[PDB]
């Protein structure tokens, strides 16, 4: 109950949410990239529907060329969720069949 | 109601949810994963739909090759709930019959 | 109004029909089969139209060799009506002067 | 507002609709069955078209040998109209001159 | 926004139709009958077609010798309408003419 | 958002509706009659068809011989409407020349 | 959010419509009629199709031999619309050449 | 959060609407009439189909003999729109030719 | 959370909308009036159809004397868009060639 | 109603319906095909027409070296029915005589 | 209820067909093709009506030189049903001796 | 549920049909050509009727020196179906032999 | 679900159909001519009986010395086929033999 | 699903035909003539059947001595179609040879 | 807590939404305008539909001889999106070709 | 609970949507320009639908030869989701093959 002139003050947290379909040749690809690296926090899964042989998702902290923080292989026709926080990039890699499936995932930030 | 300039300072406590299918091989399958693993609380259920043969989830804290905080076996045609802390992994293991099923599961964490 | 990335979300209710003429041999015939047993509801009813004796209609779960959930016994030139859950094969089983008659029926499952 | 996982959660109401047509000998013949015993609201009319003297409809709860929830005698070219809840089976009895008429009902279950 | 497990918890409110073609006899004659008693509301008309004299409806609450909740007398020719709540019977009363008429009525039930 | 156990709790508003052709003597005539006298609103009109002279209509609460809220009288080839609360019966007087025409009423009520 | 035991709570507002078709003589006749006069809004229009003469329309509080909340005065072939609140009944005027017209009304009232 | 026994409390705001078709003759005419003055906001337009010369709409608070709140004239093939609060009447003036058109409203009152 | 008897209050914001087709002559004609200048807030477009030569739109805030506001010229073919506030009245001019077209517009007033 | 930007979002269910006419060697014979194994609901029937000797219908999860998740025998003469999901071929074998019949089907896919 | 402008937002559902009759020879002939490979869903049947000799009928996903997303072996005087998706072409292959029949699809495709 | 005052709203989608007979010379002719270029979508069939040699249909987006959307060859005495999008002309090409035949094609645009 | 009193409302689409016979002489001939060229569809076909050399037909948007948006040139015994929106005439051109034939043509406009 | 008493609501769109058989003189004839000015679409054709000299049609929207907003000049032995709104009379000229021929038009309008 | 008479108090933000057809002359065209220029944000997208070279859309804060705040050139068959604020208003410039395209835009202001 | 007298003070966050579907040449083009650079946040995907060779994605903070803050690669046939901050355009760059695709983001501001 004391006045105080600070303008950087409260801070709210806000949820985002992002749908894609993807197709996985054999190099990887980038799936997803941001720039907020050092405060996010994501939840979401990963859903190989067709396709031969496992799909591999990896996400990296300071570029591909980075740290590998998680990594999840994914065989067709079963999922797999996540939750993971301070990370770059998302990478998927598949087989030369060109697996396809789906990708969810909603996205924490506590700035505006 | 002291002025003090603390920025790391009030934490509030936020809830996530997913929701998967998945169809269970004859090795561990990697069913969730994360890297929050000293600050979470799950709750959640799991239920065997088709197959035949109990169904194993197992909860790993430090990687699969870790220390099963947690596991439950599932016959087919019913369901089991959960709430488990500090846990890195989930794993699903089946007869080679590709039984499948749902997972449901809702996350708390106390960061953002 | 909380986003959530839960794939297997809202079910939705859907409904078919079926029907055909029979005619009845004096042993046990199969006039309806299915393989979604864990959630299915049916409605309809049964005519025996010509013939003599009664025609006796079973309706099993697990199998042939299962469990007499309903079993219902019309006599000729009437009918008989029914609803029913959590069955896996219809009989129907007549005198051996090859009665026939009619089945129609509704069924609801909540998947897609 | 807030997320949970519950599986059996919201229940809707449905409707079917069944009519057929009926002849009665001098014994109780079983017109309609069901297994949903618990949770069954019916509501129709019966007619007598044609023959002598009245004809009875019990509805039973438990079996033929259980417990008669409601009973009904309609003579010959009128009709009557009923709701009942919890009932398993529908017998009718008549004269041994072979009444004819006719039977519908239409039946709510909060399942699927 | 309390999370509760109350399983007979929110409750809908349903409504059927019925109708009928009914003739009187020269006695009381059951037109409708039900096992809901404590919540049912119903409302419809009575219309006598042909015949001659007064036609006589009934509601009775707790049997036919129980209490007549309401009672109304139609003439020949004309109708007469009702809205009723708590009613377990209905019997009609006519000349020993047989007139004969229509009947139609909306019923309300708040369960499922 | 204060957990309450109170089974009498939240109360829906309901309508039905009712339509009936008359035939007016000269003698008083019961043309709607209810029980639920308490709460009740009904909103309608009376069309005067074919005959001569002027038709009265009559509302009562606490029966014929209660108290009369409300009166009109409506003369042959014209029409007239109202709405009114409170009431128990209805009656409609007219010639001994046999007047005849429609009614309509659309009847309100918080129950279920 | 305080709990408070009071039975005359929220209330709820209701709408509902009326239209007829009416006759004009050369007399005042009552073409609408009611007793919630406290709290009744109507909006609508009046329509004069056939015959000569202006026809003259008033609203009364209070009986016919009340007060003239309004008035309107409408001539052959022309409609006017209104809105009034707090009247208790509605009288048309016109010429003895039987001018013949719509009378359509839409009614507010905040009870039930 | 302060329990307060104040019967005229909330207030809500309702919405009514209004269609005519208008003929214009040679000295003002009332289209529309209130007695809500004090709080009326209204929007809408005038069409001018048919005839000769300009009409002009008037919008008189405190009777005709009032206050000329607002005035618009229409040349006929076009329309004119508006709202307006606080008014009492609406009259239309037009040549001796009888021009006729539409006229629509939609009114605003925070009543009931 | 203190007791106030503040009759003025709360202030909802409530929005109308309105659609005219209009035709131009070689003069200024009023196609929008009010008198709620203070608190006015519209948006909407202008679109030309048929016809040649520009047509130009004024708002005037005080009257067509007063102070134009806002002024557009739209060519044939074309249309324009606009949102403005505090403005009194509405005039197009366009050439002596009786150009024709449309007018939408949605208003926002906070008052009631 | 949180804005999403998510691509593969809301999915709707769609219905298809095949109708042909079979004739049966003494060997399989695929009689339907498709590549949507993993999410699909089909319900029909088979009749057999004419011939001797039973017709055995067969429903095959991954190739006709598969697995057998549904198999039926008819007679000649009559009819069975069905409901199947997850299949990816149908075959039919019938001795060699000949034999011919119908064979009618409806599909469900939740995808477009 | 958000305003929001997005162009290419609700996507609708369409379905064509497309009836052929067919003519092979002893070589691969083109029977249908498209070039909206992507979001296309196709169901069917093929009927060899005369000649002698199996007919195979092959879809495409990247031109006749790409890969056989589905084969089927057709005998004379049958009949095959179908249902498919990303498939680009459609080839049928018969003997030397010209055989030909009719060829049936219905096509589904989500863009307008 | 929000007032919005946009023009190019609501958009349908609507579908036509044509019908051609073909003569076929030994240079390309043209037999359909449009100007909505961006969103067409078309299915149909060619039939060669009579003549020799193959003929050849081209679809063009952009001119018939622009890009060759697709190409089918069909044979004399067969058909080849079709549906294509993003097409400008559409051309056929035969032999000197004056070959002839049919067209038929449906179109769908979602413009008006 | 907003009252709104928007007279150029809700706009439908209407189709109409013509059909004539043709002479063309060695100058531009008008063949179809309109002024609603801002929204207008159209779709049909041109034959070319009876003559020698081609016949080539222009459409035009703004008058004859406009804009050819469309041209086609067709030979004798073929027909060609076209959909085109926005032209306002359309012109036919032939050698010096008068050629002739047929012309029909499908128009949409969303006007009324 | 507002109630709205508006009159002048929803408006149907209709249309009517006619045909007649024209001589025409060396002077402007009159063979078409409306009141219905402002809402008319009307497509159409007009043939020339015989006499010498090109028949020129003219459509005036404001009498004869109006605006010419179509004309056409059509030669003898060929036809010419139309489609044509906002139009008062169609008047023909011909040259002092008596050509003669037919007229068809159908004609939509959107009142009733 | 604390009580204040302050008239300015709360402020709400609003949002509208304007949606336009635009075609382009050789010269800078205004396309919206506004006087509210302090407080605005507005996002959207430009659609170039038809036509050749490309369209240039610049906003402008101080009338159109003020300052370029954003400037897009988009090539035709193509779309370019926005968010901007703080403009006065908005401009098109295009080739002497008429290119012609859509115009959407939401807008937001936080005064009522 | 303490009295200041503060203008800018509370601060809301809001959210926009956009969708357009675009065209690539072999030049960047820009696709998404604001003015807002210091507080925005989007997020959103890009799918790549028809054309050959991969589509590069640039968000630039400082105009077009600013800062590349952000930069993907994706192939045809695949999509790619992002958030990002501070970024005051976005181009896209792709083969002189035309490819096309959609763009859809959300964004976020805390401004009003």
Not at 39 to 55: E, F, M, N, R
Not at 76 to 96: E, H, K, M, P
């Amino acid at each position: 109950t004391n006045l105080s002139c600070c303008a950087n003050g409260q801070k709210t947290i806000v949820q985002d949410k992002v749908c894609i379909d993807w197709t996985a040749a054999a190099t990887a690809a980038i799936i997803y990239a941001d720039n907020i690296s050092q405060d996010i926090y994501a939840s979401g899964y990963l859903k190989v529907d067709t396709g031969t042989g496992p799909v591999t998702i990896v996400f990296y902290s300071g570029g591909v060329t980075g740290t590998a923080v998680e990594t999840i292989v994914v065989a067709t026709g079963s999922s797999a969720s996540f939750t993971v926080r301070r990370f770059d990039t998302v990478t998927i890699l598949g087989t030369a069949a060109a697996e396809t499936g789906e990708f969810c995932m909603t996205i924490r930030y506590t700035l505006s």
